[PDB]
Copies of this chain bind each other. A is one copy, B any other.
Amino acid sequence: GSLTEDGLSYKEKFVVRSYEVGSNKTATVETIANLLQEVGCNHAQSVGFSTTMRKLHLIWVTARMHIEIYKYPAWGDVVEIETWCQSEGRIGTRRDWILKDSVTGEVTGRATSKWVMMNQDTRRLQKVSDDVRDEYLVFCPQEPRLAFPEENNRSLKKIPKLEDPAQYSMIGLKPRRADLDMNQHVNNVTYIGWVLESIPQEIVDTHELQVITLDYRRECQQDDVVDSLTTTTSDSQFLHLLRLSGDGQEINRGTTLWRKK
């Protein structure tokens, strides 16, 4: 991969792997999500960032992830992904992505993520300071560059809390070592897989996932156990909730949109 000519964005090509595809012989949404995280980490490395504010014990954390896929790439196909960041004042930052078929050059998908500033110890959120905002802006486009430009778009919709009883459920989900990152935290993509576990297999077999919006409220520790809840709100639409198996503490909520194959 490499930064573009202006140095304000980053592109990388990936060849789809055999173990990365599902029953349709095309990449799963978790393979897509992993590739988005990888090109994001590679963009961070290219401009000197770690996966000045380290002394204050301050980190960026994901609050929301929104992904829309038009075509999933097949095993052996090449996918090109362009990514870039932008500041949103004191709320936090945003990382966007565009996915293209390397052969046709057509847009096959797009994604956007909202990130907030928090203390690594204490987990307390904060507004972004001017000192941080200054050294961040030099690696971003100055004029707004949105993967989802449309006024009143799906990526900015408020998500409601699922009411008991859920229509569907998958209980007792636990992360294994493969679900952790190099810093021993559960990888954000595992939460997507856990959300989708409560979708019935018949919907998976007859529909393709088109849109997924996921809010990240609280981290799942290594020794925690999660319950995945899903209720049909409708094309098929679902409302999702991930909560701790015991006390019911919310870790995530989201929505998915599926189209008939």
Residues of A within 8 A of B (CB): 17-19, 21-23, 25, 28, 30, 34, 37-38, 41-42, 45, 51, 75-76, 172-174, 176-178, 180-184, 187, 189, 193-194, 196-197, 204
Q: How far is the CA of A17 from the CA of B181 in the complex (A)?
A: 11
Given contacts A182-B25, A182-B75, is CB(A19)–CB(B187) below 8 Å? yes
Q: How far is the CA of A207 from the CA of B208 in the complex (A)?
A: 43
B34 near A177: Cβ-Cβ < 8 Å: no
Q: How far is the CA of A21 from the CA of B181 in the complex (A)?
A: 7
A19 near B193: Cβ-Cβ < 8 Å: no
**Residue from B182, B197, B204 in contact with A21 in the complex, judged by beta carbons closer than 8 Å:** B182
Add 5 more A-B contacts to A17-B34, A19-B37 (CB < 8 A). Answer: A18-B41, A18-B181, A19-B181, A19-B189, A23-B184
A30 near B197: Cβ-Cβ < 8 Å: no
Identify the closest chain B residue to A188 (Cβ). Answer: B19
Minimal beta-carbon separation of A219 from chain B (angstroms): 17
Identify the closest chain B residue to A26 (Cβ). Answer: B182
Q: How far is the CA of A196 from the CA of B41 in the complex (A)?
A: 27
B187 near A22: Cβ-Cβ < 8 Å: no
A34 near B19: Cβ-Cβ < 8 Å: yes
